[PDB]
Design an enzyme around this catalytic site. Structure first.
Site, PDB file in Angstrom:
ATOM      1  CD  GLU A   1     -20.925 -16.332 107.282  1.00  0.00           C
ATOM      2  OE1 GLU A   1     -19.867 -16.394 106.616  1.00  0.00           O
ATOM      3  OE2 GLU A   1     -21.848 -15.533 107.018  1.00  0.00           O
TER       4      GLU A   1
ATOM      5  NE  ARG B   1     -20.192 -10.933  98.487  1.00  0.00           N
ATOM      6  CZ  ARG B   1     -19.258  -9.996  98.330  1.00  0.00           C
ATOM      7  NH1 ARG B   1     -18.283 -10.158  97.448  1.00  0.00           N
ATOM      8  NH2 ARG B   1     -19.302  -8.888  99.050  1.00  0.00           N
TER       9      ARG B   1
ATOM     10  CD  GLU C   1     -15.329 -14.232 100.767  1.00  0.00           C
ATOM     11  OE1 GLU C   1     -15.455 -13.001 100.922  1.00  0.00           O
ATOM     12  OE2 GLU C   1     -16.293 -15.019 100.833  1.00  0.00           O
TER      13      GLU C   1
HETATM   14  O1  LIG Z   1     -22.971 -10.840 103.533  1.00  0.00           O
HETATM   15  C1  LIG Z   1     -22.561 -11.891 104.051  1.00  0.00           C
HETATM   16  O2  LIG Z   1     -23.275 -12.323 104.967  1.00  0.00           O
HETATM   17  C2  LIG Z   1     -21.357 -12.562 103.629  1.00  0.00           C
HETATM   18  C3  LIG Z   1     -20.931 -13.777 104.272  1.00  0.00           C
HETATM   19  C4  LIG Z   1     -19.730 -14.486 103.884  1.00  0.00           C
HETATM   20  C5  LIG Z   1     -18.955 -13.956 102.836  1.00  0.00           C
HETATM   21  C6  LIG Z   1     -19.330 -12.765 102.170  1.00  0.00           C
HETATM   22  C7  LIG Z   1     -20.525 -12.091 102.583  1.00  0.00           C
HETATM   23  O3  LIG Z   1     -20.820 -10.953 101.889  1.00  0.00           O
END
Ligand SMILES: O=C(O)c1ccccc1O
Ligand SMILES: Cc1cc2nc3c(=O)[nH]c(=O)nc-3n(C[C@H](O)[C@H](O)[C@H](O)COP(=O)(O)OP(=O)(O)OC[C@H]3O[C@@H](n4cnc5c(N)ncnc54)[C@H](O)[C@@H]3O)c2cc1C
Ligand code: FES
Ligand code: FES
Ligand SMILES: [Ca+2]
Length: 1297
Positions: A773, A851, A1232
């Protein structure tokens, strides 16, 4: 002669200047352009490079077929052999059944491994036309897959042995006759006697001896001559330990070293016999001889059961395993502990010996003189009244390095139960294979009774003690194993004595101690997928909600799908290799390229000086493109070597000498806390009143959970190809990334040109899961600079050790909780303090921690809560996103104290959970209302379908009847919020083109890595335009077509892009209706032409942004999520209290994916995510030295879920009638959320461990500590008993990060 000759896919291949250092993998990809065969590790453990090889067995006068690892097979050893690769068995035009099946059964996702698995299954079928379900599975021991979760693969291949997602009824039959002929030329050659061959290489000479005389004579004249057979040992030394033997000599041809002679004492195998030969020949013996003569044979066989895989065992010889003399060898122990007779020849000389403590002098050494070679090994028959056992324990059953391996033998006085002879040999306890020379003698004449057991254990414990600071670590666990193994031996021997009438003398065995002697048992799989049927109406052309196979399945299954490194090289192209620091935090005082320059093909060495514009990159500009003045982690990029071939780039990088002056390093989370070294202020969320909540607390538990990290292990490592355009600073990059936008921006900022000039193209990735990413750019930019400075195209494919070392991974966590609750189970106060080890760069760390906090509540309403987070700024490779993005860490902690709440309260977990669970309409700790709540049904359907209660009982029953084998069964719930934590990243764009022939070319900002995003997007568009998906196509992702795209992450990609593709399609239909109206039933092709000949645009962009997102920490308000993913998993395990190993017996899942866009894709995402989680919580562990240097760098030490590591009974179900309107066609993200549900296995293991602890007198606390991952080590140790007790008696190898 010196001309190497062999075949590949039928076509002959003559090589006049073969280099001994050339591997069949490189010769296939770079010298024959056959790229189906992939490179996943070059270590021998993933099998991505699997290829079949055939040949005529001089002896048996027959043609033989076997798999092998292309990455380790030297071509100089393939003379007169027929190679077969994935391309050689079928194509998309004509798929081989193996390929057709894996593809249709949904066994391919990213597709990077499908060629290798296809080849293993293929090779199997060539040897066994109708294999057994068990043979099929054993085929894949050397093959790893990180996306599928293995279910589909096996379910699909099942059809070869002995609604719905697919239909085996439609699989094309198999026809053995329609297989590639065996090169007639090769049969013509089998007539003339092979002669000695010599291959001179760039720096290595290889002699292929044909006769014993030659071999011994050569060794005599040049003892230095390194022997090589399967090269599965030497290959690793040269490649990884940077070794170089200038004079190899392969004797694999010599008949002597290949004979299998049945002698009186036993069977003698030549030193070059393949372990697969030994395996097959012994297997025949233990089937026709009296069980009393095959005790040792069955001991060897048991070891081989977990000895690499089919690919390695097909070329790895016995003699190689013997002479390698590895302390962790799994055969030397068995050979020594059975006195194997080894013959040793040398020109003129010839002696014989028995394996014993004298045979292995020092570290990796033996009795053999420099000029002698191991001729043969005689594996002895077991004498009457003689018993043998073999043990092995590592981190994973399949293909792994043993932590402790052992060979145990016992010979009783005739007719008695009196020890006449006792041998106990171990591996993994010393720098060599050893015997308990002290403990065993003090046991002669004694009887096999409880007193002897105590005698030995006490002896082993004393004789095999370990230095706390001993290499390898896990001191306690290993000691326990030496004892636990003997215990199993003791209990086993008893059973054997009893099974000889002497039952009365030895004494009947407790019927609850029996299972402790059983060898590992398979037990056939039983999967069950369940999803909804599309409405009775939905036209057959509306594929939305249908199980449509991944569009690239067939291509991936055939090796035609293209991956970055598969793209051919311009005759132009140069190779690049990064140069990283070996200090966690030093000062660079001097760099020295002196040596690098002597390397043939050396172009240049790029450093910070060579950066055109800025040396400041990374998602927060705190990172360097190339280290300047000081290195801040091991694996920190200092420069980049550029040369012609990748081989020369590497040898050159090794020639880049660096000098340092170390600085105070902050390695661990602790180090960080003590140094107040963080990334920003602390994040915090709090609702209610803590003091008040704690006051009303009947109970109050405190504790600290630590969650290990995790390497993504995408089968395809990081790869970038930069092609400079020569004008305007224009550059095209072919990259394996999930983030084109930042790859582009980083190359631009680095060069000093606008984004105008940079184009990034992604066709597909062989997996990413957040690891690509943003960390891919660390490679991208290096290459961009190589291109921009040479004008030539530059390419870089990271090796596994470099990728793992450099790219970082998931965030390790440290929680400090204190929960307050009532006797009723009800929780009334929570307070968690998280600490993630961020690493070298901020990156996404702080967003990951946000998160976590967003899910510290998992599925439960908690009136008084307060969680906080701190990201540690440490001198380690910076960590990033990983499927879950902090969500799992935050939820594992939640479910941990939750489990301890259930225990302390004495109530059943299911009830304690259902009680504290949220309700339809409740606000979370961050004040987001939970509408359309659906967790309850997932819960009630999971208990019902998995038949929890009833099985809860059957588990207790099993535990009552078993002492050293306990079972757990836990049910876990989850709640995952969908959307990026950063609101604006919630935007997607698409670009559609309708050509005059009607066909449609679509593209969107999202990339493809295995999730089947294009397949879904295509299905969306096809339904939107009302035309079959056959007319739509997506070729790739690039900054040309769609700009400023969010990375492919957060599970949102199909939500964002699918909405964009939808709008784009609606614009086209608008434009097209006037023509449609005129000719209502006229074909699509017709309306298109009309529009064209009427000057109507047939190209439009599509855009979408998620509405109403936005959360404030300062005021704890504003919804940070569009909606929530929901699900429940119900796993059952069965640990082996004596070793730590266990086996997931069954799992039941019920996931809420709204109206699935594609049932098959989602279910495959659920299974895959789950298996990734199961590995995070119980198998994958990373070890870093005290100085911050990573140790685990390949699949050999990093053990990800294997084929046999998945629920033997996998059941997945998609919540019915649960349309999520606010998302593309009432669907839901699914990539996820499913990963945390693997928790259910973690806590099922927790139970099984408590049940074992409950039968051991000494209290020692009931709420013990079980950190993540629950490895075999953590599990064994937790099962405190008479063995953990008699063996627990800084400077250590690793250290907790
Ligand atoms: O907010 C992000 O940048 C993010 C990135 C990867 C997976 C979940 C996510 O919330
Ligand atoms: C993925 C993977 C998994 C593995 N799993 C396991 C495991 O579970 N347990 C285990 O024990 N090993 C394991 N191995 C190790 C390896 O496969 C064995 O040690 C193998 O049996 C060595 O055989 P080889 O023929 O490949 O040896 P080579 O690599 O060809 O040679 C090894 C050494 O043996 C010497 N040698 C070979 N034959 C003779 C001879 N006749 N006379 C004198 N010297 C000789 C050579 O000089 C050289 O030093 C694994 C390797 C890989 C790559
Ligand atoms: S690359 Fe050869 S086994 Fe993984
Ligand atoms: S589908 Fe096999 S490694 Fe991804
Ligand atoms: Ca970081």
């Amino acid at each position: 002669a010196d001309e190497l000759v062999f075949f590949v896919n039928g076509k002959k291949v003559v090589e006049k200047n073969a280099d001994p250092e050339t591997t069949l993998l490189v010769y296939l990809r770079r010298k024959l352009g056959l790229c189906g065969t992939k490179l996943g590790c070059g270590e021998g453990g993933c099998g991505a490079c699997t290829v079949m090889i055939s040949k005529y067995d001089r002896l048996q006068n027959k043609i033989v077929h076997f798999s092998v690892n292309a990455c380790l097979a030297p071509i100089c050893s393939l003379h007169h052999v027929a190679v077969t690769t994935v391309e050689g068995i079928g194509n998309t035009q004509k798929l081989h059944p193996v390929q057709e099946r894996i593809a249709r059964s949904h066994g391919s996702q990213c597709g990077f491994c499908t060629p290798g698995i296809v080849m293993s299954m293929y090779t199997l079928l060539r040897n066994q036309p109708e294999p057994t379900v068990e043979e099929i599975e054993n085929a894949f021991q050397g093959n790893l897959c990180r996306c599928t979760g293995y279910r589909p693969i096996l379910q699909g291949f099942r059809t070869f042995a002995k609604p719905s997602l697919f239909n085996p009824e439609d699989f094309k039959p198999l026809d053995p006759t329609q297989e590639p002929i065996f090169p007639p030329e090769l049969l013509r050659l089998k007539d003339t006697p092979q002669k000695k061959l010599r291959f001179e290489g760039e720096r290595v000479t290889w002699i292929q001896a044909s006769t014993m005389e030659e071999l011994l004579d050569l060794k005599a004249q040049h003892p230095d001559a390194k022997l090589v057979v399967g090269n599965t040992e030497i290959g690793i030394e040269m490649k990884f330990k940077n070794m170089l033997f200038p004079l190899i000599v392969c004797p694999a041809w010599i008949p002597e070293l290949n004979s299998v002679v049945h002698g009186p004492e036993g069977i003698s195998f030549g030193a070059s016999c393949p372990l697969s030969l030994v395996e097959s020949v012994l297997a025949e013996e233990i089937a026709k001889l009296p069980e009393q003569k095959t005790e040792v044979f069955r001991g060897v066989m048991e070891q081989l059961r977990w000895f690499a895989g089919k690919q390695v065992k097909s070329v790895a010889s016995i003699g190689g395993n013997i002479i390698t003399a590895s302390p962790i060898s799994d055969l030397n122990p068995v050979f020594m502990a059975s006195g194997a007779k080894l013959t040793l020849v040398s020109r003129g000389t010839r002696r014989t010996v028995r394996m014993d403590h004298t045979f292995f002098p020092g570290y990796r050494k033996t009795l053999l003189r420099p000029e002698e070679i191991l001729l043969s090994i005689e594996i002895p028959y077991s004498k009457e009244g003689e018993f043998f056992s073999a043990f092995k324990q590592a981190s994973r059953r399949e293909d792994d390095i043993a932590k402790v391996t052992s060979g145990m033998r016992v010979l009783f006085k005739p007719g008695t139960i009196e020890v006449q002879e006792l041998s106990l040999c171990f591996g993994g306890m010393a720098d060599r294979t050893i015997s308990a020379l002290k403990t065993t003698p003090k046991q002669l004449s004694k009887s096999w009774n409880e007193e002897l057991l105590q005698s030995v254990c006490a002896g082993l414990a004393e004789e095999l003690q370990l230095a706390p600071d001993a290499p390898g670590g896990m001191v306690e666990f290993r000691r326990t194993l030496t004892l636990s193994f003997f215990f199993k031996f003791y209990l086993t021997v008893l059973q054997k004595l009893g099974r000889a009438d002497l039952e009365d003398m030895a004494g009947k065995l407790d019927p609850t101690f029996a299972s402790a002697t059983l060898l590992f048992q398979k037990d056939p799989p039983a999967n069950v997928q369940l999803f909804q049927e599309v409405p009775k109406d939905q036209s057959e052309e509306d594929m939305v909600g249908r199980p449509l196979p991944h569009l690239a399945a067939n291509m991936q299954a055939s090796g035609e799908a293209v991956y970055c490194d598969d793209i051919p090289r311009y005759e132009n192209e140069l190779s690049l290799r990064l140069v990283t620091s070996t200090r966690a935090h030093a000062k660079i005082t001097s760099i020295d390229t002196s040596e690098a320059k002597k390397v043939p093909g050396f172009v240049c060495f790029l450093t910070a000086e060579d950066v055109p514009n800025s040396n400041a990159t990374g998602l927060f500009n705190d990172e360097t493109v190339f280290a300047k003045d000081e290195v801040t982690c091991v694996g920190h990029i200092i420069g980049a070597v550029v040369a012609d071939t990748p081989e020369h780039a590497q040898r050159a990088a090794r020639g880049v000498k660096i000098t340092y002056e170390d600085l105070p390093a902050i390695i661990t989370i602790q180090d960080a806390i003590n140094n107040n070294s963080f990334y920003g202020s602390e994040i915090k969320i709090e609702k209610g009143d803590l003091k008040k909540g704690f006051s009303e607390a009947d109970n109050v538990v405190s504790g600290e959970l630590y969650i290990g990290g995790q390497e993504h292990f995408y089968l395809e490592t990081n790869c970038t190809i930069a092609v400079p355009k020569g004008e305007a600073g224009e550059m095209e990059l072919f990259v394996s990334t999930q983030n084109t936008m930042k790859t582009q921006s980083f190359v631009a900022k680095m060069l000093g040109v606008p984004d105008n000039r940079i184009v990034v193209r992604v066709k597909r990735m062989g997996g990413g899961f957040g690891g690509k990413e943003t960390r891919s750019t660390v490679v991208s930019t290096a290459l961009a600079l190589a291109a921009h400075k040479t004008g030539r195209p530059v390419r870089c494919m990271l090796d596994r050790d470099e990728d793992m070392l450099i790219t970082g991974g998931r965030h390790p966590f440290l929680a400090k909780y204190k929960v307050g609750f009532m006797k009723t189970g009800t929780v009334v106060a929570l307070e968690v303090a998280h600490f993630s080890n961020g690493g070298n760069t901020e990156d996404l760390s702080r967003s990951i921690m946000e998160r976590a906090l967003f899910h510290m509540d998992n599925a439960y309403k908690i009136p008084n809560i307060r969680g906080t987070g701190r990201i540690c700024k440490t001198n380690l490779p910076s960590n990033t996103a990983f499927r879950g993005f902090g969500g799992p860490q935050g939820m594992l902690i939640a479910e941990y104290w939750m489990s301890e709440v259930a225990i302390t309260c004495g109530l059943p977990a299911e009830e304690v959970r259902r009680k504290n669970m949220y309700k339809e309409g409740d606000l979370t700790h961050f004040n987001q209302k939970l509408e359309g709540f659906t967790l309850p049904r997932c819960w009630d359907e999971c208990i019902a379908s998995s038949q929890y209660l009833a099985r809860k009982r059957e588990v207790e029953k099993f535990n009552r009847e078993n002492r050293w084998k306990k079972r757990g069964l836990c049910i876990i719930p989850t709640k995952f919020g969908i959307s990026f934590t950063l609101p604006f990243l919630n935007q997607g764009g698409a670009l559609v083109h309708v050509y005059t022939d009607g066909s449609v070319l679509l593209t969107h900002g999202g990339t493809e890595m295995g999730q089947g995003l294009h397949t879904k997007m295509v299905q969306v568009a096809s339904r939107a335009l009302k035309i079959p998906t056959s007319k739509i196509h997506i070729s790739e992702t690039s900054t040309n077509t769609v700009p400023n795209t969010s990375p492919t992450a957060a599970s949102a990609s199909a939500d964002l892009n699918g909405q964009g593709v939808y709008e784009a399609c609606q614009t086209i239909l608008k434009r097209l209706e006037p023509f449609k109206k005129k000719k209502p039933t006229g074909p699509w092709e017709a309306w298109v032409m009309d529009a064209y000949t009427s000057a109507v645009s047939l190209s439009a962009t599509g855009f979408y942004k998620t509405p109403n997102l936005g959360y404030s920490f300062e005021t704890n308000s504003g919804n940070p999520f569009h909606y929530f993913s929901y699900g429940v998993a119900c796993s059952e395990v069965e640990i082996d209290c004596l070793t730590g190993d266990h086996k997931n017996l069954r799992t039941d899942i019920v996931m809420d994916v709204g109206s699935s866009l594609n049932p098959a894709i989602d279910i495959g995402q659920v299974e895959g995510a789950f298996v990734q989680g199961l590995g995070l919580f119980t198998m994958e562990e990373l070890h870093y030295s005290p100085e911050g240097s990573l140790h685990t760098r390949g699949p050999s030490t990093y053990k990800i879920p294997a084929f046999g590591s998945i629920p033997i009974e996998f059941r997945v179900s998609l919540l019915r009638d649960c349309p999520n309107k606010r998302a593309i066609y009432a669907s839901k993200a699914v990539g996820e959320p499913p990963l945390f549900l693997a928790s259910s296995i973690f806590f099922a293991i927790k139970d099984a461990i408590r049940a074992a602890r409950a039968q051991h007198g000494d209290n020692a606390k009931q709420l013990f500590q079980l950190d993540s991952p629950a490895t075999p080590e953590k599990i064994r140790n937790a099962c405190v008993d008479q063995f953990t007790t008699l063996c627990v008696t800084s400077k250590s190898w690793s250290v907790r990060i």
